[PDB]
Amino acid sequence: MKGTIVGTWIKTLRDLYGNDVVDESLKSVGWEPDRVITPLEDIDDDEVRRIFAKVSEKTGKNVNEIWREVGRQNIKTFSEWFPSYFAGRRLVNFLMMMDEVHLQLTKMIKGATPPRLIAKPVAKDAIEMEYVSKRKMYDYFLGLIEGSSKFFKEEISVEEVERGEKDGFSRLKVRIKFKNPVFEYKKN
Ligand code: HEM
């Protein structure tokens, strides 16, 4: 995982569960509770999974529940660290932009494996978005969508069409319906 993001996660964990749970979880994996993660640092994914498992243990919450909660809250952390991506944006616009954003923010890393998040209109008031990644972070993905809905104050309906692994990649396809029309048919 890219260091910058793991950093936002540590902060989000502190905002949700407190400094004691977080400092202890970090120590459990050999980290200094106040460790400084550089932007381009490549934090091992399992190491992050071990931190979340420890948070799970200490909080009594299911680890998937924690990822879901971190995803909802991390949007707020994101708007504070990367305000430029939210500045005068609408939810549909924000989401359609994500696949490109993840590519741009990892292009400086050789062999980068960002999640693919291709989205496409499928109705005047709905889009289909497919999470594709080897990391299997379904709940984080679903939580970020829910958190995004809350940030932009735009109500949505999220239908999980399919989830599973195809050719080594975990995939989750959702259909996101908005309260109002957001698309119009136009000449291709
Ligand atoms: C403007 C806010 C956002 C920024 C700056 C951002 C940035 C990033 C970056 C740099 C990574 C690390 C990728 C890697 O190390 O390979 C990441 C991971 C991830 N992002 Fe975002 N992201 C944002 C919002 C979102 C949203 C809204 C979604 C979902 C629709 C999303 C889905 C994910 C997921 C699921 C991962 C976890 C890694 C994986 O599953 O492979 N992100 N994000």
Closest to 99 (Cα-Cα) out of 129, 68, 139, 67: 129
Query: How many whole angstroms separate alpha carbon 63 and alpha carbon 181?
Result: 36
Q: What is the experimental resolution, given in Å to one decimal place?
A: 2.1
Kindly report the three-state secondary structure assignment for every residue of the chain.
CEHHHHHHHHHHHHHHHCHHHHHHHHHHCCCCCCCCCCCCCECCHHHHHHHHHHHHHHHCCCHHHHHHHHHHHHHHHHHHHCHHHCCCCCHHHHHHHHHHHHHHCCCCCCCCCCCECCEEEEECCEEEEEEEECCCCHHHHHHHHHHHHHHCCCCEEEEEEEEEEECCEEEEEEEEEECCCCCCCCCC
In order of their start, the domains of the chain are 2-188 (3.90.1520.10)
Is 8 within any annotated ligand binding site?
Answer: no
The technique is X-ray
Six-digit token string for 7: 């950093």
Strand 126-133 relative to strand 156-166, pairing:
unpaired
Q: Is the C-beta atom of 98 inside 6 A of ligand 1?
A: yes
Which residues are paired to 121 by β-bridges?
127
Question: Residue with the nearest Cα to atom 12 of ligand 1?
Answer: 2
Q: Which residue has tokens 């879901």?
A: 68
Q: How far is CA 141 from the centre of its chain?
A: 5
Is 28 within any annotated ligand binding site?
Answer: no
Contact 9, 69 (CB under 8 A): no
Pocket test for ligand 1, best of 5, 9, 93, 105 (most atoms within 8 A of CB): 5
